[PDB]
Paper text:
In the present study, we elucidated the crystal structure of Mycobacterium tuberculosis H37Rv HigA2 (hereafter referred to as MtHigA2), which contains an HTH motif. The HigA antitoxin represses the transcription of HigBA or forms a stable HigBA complex, thereby preventing the ribonuclease activity of the HigB toxin and the associated cytotoxic events. Structural studies of MtHigA2 confirmed that it has three regions: (i) a disordered N-terminus that is liable to cleavage, (ii) an α-helix bundle containing an HTH motif for DNA binding and (iii) a β-lid for dimerization. The antitoxin MtHigA2 has two binding partners: DNA and the toxin MtHigB2.
The crystal structure of MtHigA2 was determined from three distinct crystal forms. Form I belonged to space group P212121 and was determined to 2.0 Å resolution, form II packed in space group P43212 and was determined to 3.2 Å resolution, and form III was solved in space group P3121 to 3.4 Å resolution. Due to a lack of electron density at the N-terminus, ∼25 residues are undefined in each monomer despite the relatively high resolution. All dimers share the β-lid as their major dimeric interface, but the position of the α-helix bundle varies. When the different dimers are aligned based on a single HTH motif from one monomer, the corresponding motif in the dimer pair shows a different relative position. The flexibility in dimerization leads to drastic changes in the locations of positively charged residues on the HTH motif, including His54, Arg56 and Arg59. The greatest change in distance is that between the Nδ atoms of His54, which move by ∼7 Å [Figs. 1(c) and 1(d)]. To predict the physiological dimer, each form was submitted to the PISA server to calculate the strength of the dimer interface. Interestingly, all of the forms had similarly favourable dissociation energies (ΔG): −14, −15 and −17 kcal mol−1 for forms I, II and III, respectively. This suggests that the flexibility of the β-lid does not impact the formation of a stable dimer and is likely to contribute to function.
Numbering used by the authors:
A (entry chain A): 31 to 100
B (entry chain B): 34 to 101
Write the structure that this text describes.
């Protein structure tokens, strides 16, 4: 979960320092995200972290029928 | 927008803030289009308070997995 993100970064030979520099976010925010502390992360920060791992972050809201993208 | 979804659920900003047990200024920024600065747990509670569910997924090609 946190392990999944750690694995994704480590499979690309990036340190938490390098991902922090790629994402323009604090290394302390990289460590906390990787320790499972997703709840507390800001959206733009999580977005940047995931882009630095080569991913895309999809944030969606399901309300009854509809599902909207934020 | 969320504003439009919130309003469509008959709720006021003060009420959603109260129901989500979050600072109203937090709801104000989310509803004014500023999703970027929202903490995931804040956005999660705000969406639950509307009666909805928040999905956060990482996509790498066709591979996806949930974060929250």
């Amino acid at each position: 979960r946190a392990f999944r993100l750690r694995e994704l970064r480590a499979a690309q030979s990036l340190t938490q320092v390098q991902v922090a520099a790629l994402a323009h976010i604090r290394q302390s925010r990289v460590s906390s995200i990787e320790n499972g502390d997703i709840g507390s992360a800001q959206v733009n920060t999580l977005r940047k972290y995931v882009s630095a791992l080569g991913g895309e972050l999809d944030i969606t809201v399901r309300l009854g029928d509809e599902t909207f993208t934020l």
